[PDB]
Amino acid sequence: GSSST
Amino acid sequence: GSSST
Amino acid sequence: CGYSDRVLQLTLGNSTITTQEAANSVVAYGRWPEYLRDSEANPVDQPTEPDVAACRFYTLDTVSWTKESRGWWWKLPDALRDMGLFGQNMYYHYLGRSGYTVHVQCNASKFHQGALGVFAVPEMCLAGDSNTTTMHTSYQNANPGEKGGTFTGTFTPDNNQTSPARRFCPVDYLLGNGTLLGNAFVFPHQIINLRTNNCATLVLPYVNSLSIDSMVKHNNWGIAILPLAPLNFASESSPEIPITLTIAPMCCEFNGLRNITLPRLQ
Amino acid sequence: CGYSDRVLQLTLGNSTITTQEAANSVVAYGRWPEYLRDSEANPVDQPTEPDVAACRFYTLDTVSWTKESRGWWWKLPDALRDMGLFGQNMYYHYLGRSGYTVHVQCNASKFHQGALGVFAVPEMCLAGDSNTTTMHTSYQNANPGEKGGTFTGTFTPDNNQTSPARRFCPVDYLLGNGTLLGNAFVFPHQIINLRTNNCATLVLPYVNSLSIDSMVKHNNWGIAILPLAPLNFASESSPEIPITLTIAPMCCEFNGLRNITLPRLQ
Amino acid sequence: GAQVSSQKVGAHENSSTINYTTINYYRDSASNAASKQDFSQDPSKFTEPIKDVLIKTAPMLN
Amino acid sequence: GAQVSSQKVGAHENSSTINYTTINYYRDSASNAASKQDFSQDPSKFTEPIKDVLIKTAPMLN
Amino acid sequence: AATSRDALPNTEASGPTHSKEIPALTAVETGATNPLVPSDTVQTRHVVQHRSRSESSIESFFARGACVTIMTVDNPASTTNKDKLFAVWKITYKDTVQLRRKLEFFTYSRFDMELTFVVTANFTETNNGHALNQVYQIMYVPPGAPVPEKWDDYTWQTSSNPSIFYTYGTAPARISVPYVGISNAYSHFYDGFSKVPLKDQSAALGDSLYGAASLNDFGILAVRVVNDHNPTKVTSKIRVYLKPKHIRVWCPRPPRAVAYYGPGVDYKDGTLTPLSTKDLTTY
Amino acid sequence: AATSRDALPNTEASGPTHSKEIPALTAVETGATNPLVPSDTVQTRHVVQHRSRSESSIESFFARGACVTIMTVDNPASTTNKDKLFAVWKITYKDTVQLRRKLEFFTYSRFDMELTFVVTANFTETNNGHALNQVYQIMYVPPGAPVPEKWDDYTWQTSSNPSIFYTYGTAPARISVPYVGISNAYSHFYDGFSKVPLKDQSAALGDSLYGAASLNDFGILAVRVVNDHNPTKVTSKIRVYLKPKHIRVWCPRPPRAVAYYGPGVDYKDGTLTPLSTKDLTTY
Numbered sequence A, B: 001g002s003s004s005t
Numbered sequence C, D: 001c002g003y004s005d006r007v008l009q010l011t012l013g014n015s016t017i018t019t020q021e022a023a024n025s026v027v028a029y030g031r032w033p034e035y036l037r038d039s040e041a042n043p044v045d046q047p048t049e050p051d052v053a054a055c056r057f058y059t060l061d062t063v064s065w066t067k068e069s070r071g072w073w074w075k076l077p078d079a080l081r082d083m084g085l086f087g088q089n090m091y092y093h094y095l096g097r098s099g100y101t102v103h104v105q106c107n108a109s110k111f112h113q114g115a116l117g118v119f120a121v122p123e124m125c126l127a128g129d130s131n132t133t134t135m136h137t138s139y140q141n142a143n144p145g146e147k148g149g150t151f152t153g154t155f156t157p158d159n160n161q162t163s164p165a166r167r168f169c170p171v172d173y174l175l176g177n178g179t180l181l182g183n184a185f186v187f188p189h190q191i192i193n194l195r196t197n198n199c200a201t202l203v204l205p206y207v208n209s210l211s212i213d214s215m216v217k218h219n220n221w222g223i224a225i226l227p228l229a230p231l232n233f234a235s236e237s238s239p240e241i242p243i244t245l246t247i248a249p250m251c252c253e254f255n256g257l258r259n260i261t262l263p264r265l266q
Numbered sequence E, F: 001g002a003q004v005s006s007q008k009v010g011a012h013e014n015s016s017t018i019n020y021t022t023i024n025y026y027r028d029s030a031s032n033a034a035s036k037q038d039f040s041q042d043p044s045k046f047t048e049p050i051k052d053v054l055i056k057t058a059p060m061l062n
Numbered sequence G, H: 001a002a003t004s005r006d007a008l009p010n011t012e013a014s015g016p017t018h019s020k021e022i023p024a025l026t027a028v029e030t031g032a033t034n035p036l037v038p039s040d041t042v043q044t045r046h047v048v049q050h051r052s053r054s055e056s057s058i059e060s061f062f063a064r065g066a067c068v069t070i071m072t073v074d075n076p077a078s079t080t081n082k083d084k085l086f087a088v089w090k091i092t093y094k095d096t097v098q099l100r101r102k103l104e105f106f107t108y109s110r111f112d113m114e115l116t117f118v119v120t121a122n123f124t125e126t127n128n129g130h131a132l133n134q135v136y137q138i139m140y141v142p143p144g145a146p147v148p149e150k151w152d153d154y155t156w157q158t159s160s161n162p163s164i165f166y167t168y169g170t171a172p173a174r175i176s177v178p179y180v181g182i183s184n185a186y187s188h189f190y191d192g193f194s195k196v197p198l199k200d201q202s203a204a205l206g207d208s209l210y211g212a213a214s215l216n217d218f219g220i221l222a223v224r225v226v227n228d229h230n231p232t233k234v235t236s237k238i239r240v241y242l243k244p245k246h247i248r249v250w251c252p253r254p255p256r257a258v259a260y261y262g263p264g265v266d267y268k269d270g271t272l273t274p275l276s277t278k279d280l281t282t283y
């Protein structure tokens, strides 16, 4: 999915 | 993902 | 790593002094300044303690050392009476106590000669100008403020019995008080010997027969500077070098606040 | 045990420099010289690395500092183009890279005054003498070799439109390039202040937008020496002291060997 | 493929970290916006380029 | 990175909480819309700034 | 790990001092700047610092679109004896002064580049006729490719060159360009020549400009109005805005203190006295 | 935890009373407002309250774009002896009255700001010619930066200043600005001066305006038509709408009751009698 930080 | 509330 | 007896930095409040040619520094009677302890306290009211506003380095007017110079003197706290918020705090309260860092400044060159004796004297009572009456120096003449006074090589009595000069006549070899200068070394002191050092630095505790007193009526310390060895340079018959005096109040506190004291200083 | 910031010994190849009056030494941008790494390499042929034959101390012609002196400049590698096996290696190869130890020498006496600003400038492009045309300084005039060039206190435009002088006109307070000298301190530098030190020592890395380049077409570093405080002595109206410049190539390597380049230097 | 980062929040509403989402649309990174997540370094190489480390309380020359 | 919140629903259709989605597109929070999720406080500091706490059933002056 | 937007160091409380430690005393001859903070020379209180250097990061300093050139093109009546004006611009940050001075705080730089094009048009003749909406062609011609000689010659075919077709009145055109240097970094200064004068060879043959590397570093932009000649003449201007994104810089330099005079570091007579009068003892 | 949109307190049923408790009696001298509710003085029924104070929250009260200024610019014929008009506006909420009065219910405020620009144009001459679509440049010039003296001078390059390039006929332009104050909050009132008159120093030297802090608080907006002079003159207006978002306010104040007269609190003669006639015993 989507890699935050 | 997406933090609701 | 490089550190030395000769190279010092002093910092109090917004002021810093540096010196590259010191001869260590003296703490009078081995006692660093301190605030008044509860066990030795006497006035019961909450003291005023100005801290950085008054405990900082005030620089007084520069004097000039020449082959004619017999010597200079100042009294504390009197010399600081007109200095910033220290003086203001002093004149608004009945009682006050204070310690001091005295830093005497006098540089010259590898080809000049001379030695200044810098003495810090507890209760430095000086002798007056009269041989007809005694203990008669006026408050105005006893307290020069910042400007200080000088020593004379000769006692010359005030003859005007009708309008007395009412001042001190401090003879240098008698330390202006009837005792011989060669023994003044039992007082906390340093020597500015021009081949060795720029300056003198003395840290003075509050000294008194009382824990706190009237600063306006009473001086605790006297700073006396006398030429132990006369100024000399190369071959010039009348040389001159400046002596600048910088003093800092320390651990000072005040009691008995009221309206401001306005002294008759003239 | 005795060791100090002021007392140094440097040794490269058959040459040793000693100094008893240094003010430490500077490594430009914090980078010591190094040979070209395989990950940053670009020409594929086996490099020539002269080592002790070229990476040693070459001493250039001594210049003279006087009350009239506005300043001196040199370019690298140009100043070293005629120096022993370094110059030979430079002119036989298309490509070359090199770092440098620059050691500026200038002693005087405890009674002299003055301060030299020694600046190592990456890509030190200087301004030309023309107001009718731009970017027109000839290769011969841009490259003085060992002798270097000087700064002027005044911009004086080349008027001869028929036979142009085609050279630099480097105005000292503008660092010869349109910027103010007081800011030249953002460049790797040292100051020879005569009361403090004999010399300046700067260690320079190879700096460029490329890993290796044409040394004959391009200078990487400029050495600029300007009097920040004018020479003065005792009372003599026209004093003089020498400034000797000694430079060493470091970690230098060369690529693209062929016949020797014979440049039109006049 | 979404990248989610924190906002350094200045003047907070009269209304816990606040975030913003980013997605790259193009294959060439030159097409990308500026992240603005930059680093800082110490001025040492410019302000202190001397070979021997300096102690500020100590004499610079010894 | 999506933020999901509830709508305080007024006039409900002739059709359980209803939601709305929000995503911040910009790094600077000043670029953000107004959340409108604000708080309320008690008027006390303006209406009752007296040092001694007041009991409304009691005499104000005693 | 120190982020550009982290808060700066807190001020620590510091008291009186009487010691052999000398922070105030130093020797600038060494080449170093004395790293002092207020507590080294004055009595300080404790302050929790909140300020940050976020906006003075290299990205942030250059994160703005700067005008680097204004190109002029037209579309005249079929009749007028003079040729239809198409524009040719050699790409550079040096035709204007502001961005140039900012980039010149540094010797070398490396960045991706964003170009934004603001296009405006107007009528020139006291006339009265009209023009239909113009479409502009902005073609990049890289060094080597055929430069256009006519508004309508074969080169505008662009089979391989990158062109933008801009429609008047729409949002301003924009493209991104990679780091295109043949060097590891862009050189803002080049202390050298592109040619060696050889003794043996003639003087005129070995000559070149000082500080100039490739005669044509990055090529040209060629712009035209694609629409055919219209009875009423319209003139148009293309303003080019350049922004350095994803930037890195090396070797700091003093800023330009006197007016720029050309592509190099040259200064001109009469412009060399920037600083004004102020007396030593006057606040 | 009490949200702005939570329902207000329910009314509770209350019966008859005969006691020593005196809610109705009080003393306003204390500085307090008596916290009474209907059940304290009348018999009440039970009501389940549904109303809320959502729309009177500080955000909600200010959550609207308000007109703070109208800037006028033009683009004349090349020929006309008079200069092409570009606009310069000093940024402020005080040139208009409505938003000013709302913000002035409070002494201090803190907010992010949204600016929206509505641009309109028209023909001025009875003439008959035309103009092609105008692009406008709105440049922010912060205090210190070179203010433009000409529609086309070097300052419009904007290498570092933030500019908006607006295309006529497109949706109105919009930007957001952070809290930019050099203070912890914006001061709507400053009871002081920016200068101390010193005895020793001359009277004229120590003088300054009352209630004014920095002579130039936030800089100026400079607007121009980027298009070149067109034979038919077009005049244009830029309306600036300001909305305070993410707002906080401190220290409540009475609203302005008499007409504003300038940037300060000054009132003018003849405008001081707001209230109208109504008799004490007339409903």
Ligand SMILES: CCOC(=O)c1ccc(OCCCC2CCN(c3ccc(C)nn3)CC2)cc1
Binding pocket: G091, G092, G093, G094, G113, G115, G138, G139, G140, G162, G163, G164, G175, G177, G180, G186, G187, G217, G218, G221
């Ligand atoms: C000496 C001048 O300034 C510079 O050093 C300098 C200036 C600019 C710079 O960018 C290099 C040019 C890259 C080109 C390559 C692609 N470009 C394009 C491509 C397509 C289109 C339609 N329009 N422009 C235009 C820019 C890099 C360095």
Ligand SMILES: CCOC(=O)c1ccc(OCCCC2CCN(c3ccc(C)nn3)CC2)cc1
Binding pocket: H091, H092, H093, H094, H113, H115, H138, H139, H140, H162, H163, H164, H175, H177, H180, H186, H187, H217, H218, H221
């Ligand atoms: C005394 C006047 O009113 C105020 O107190 C007051 C008024 C305004 C206010 O905002 C401060 C101004 C911030 C500026 C900063 C950025 N601005 C910009 C920036 C870019 C562009 C294109 N256009 N405008 C314009 C607004 C803050 C306080």
Ligand SMILES: *C(=O)CCCCCCCCCCCCC
Binding pocket: A001, A002, E001, E002, E023, E024, E025, E026
């Ligand atoms: C990672 O990105 C997975 C989640 C994708 C969410 C929707 C992305 C929005 C559409 C992007 C289209 C592609 C851009 C060319």
Ligand SMILES: *C(=O)CCCCCCCCCCCCC
Binding pocket: A002, B001, B002, E002, E004, E021, E022, E023, F001, F002, F023, F024, F025, F026
């Ligand atoms: C958290 O946000 C992960 C889910 C992302 C869903 C798609 C977001 C829609 C595209 C936003 C693009 C970025 C805005 C600059």
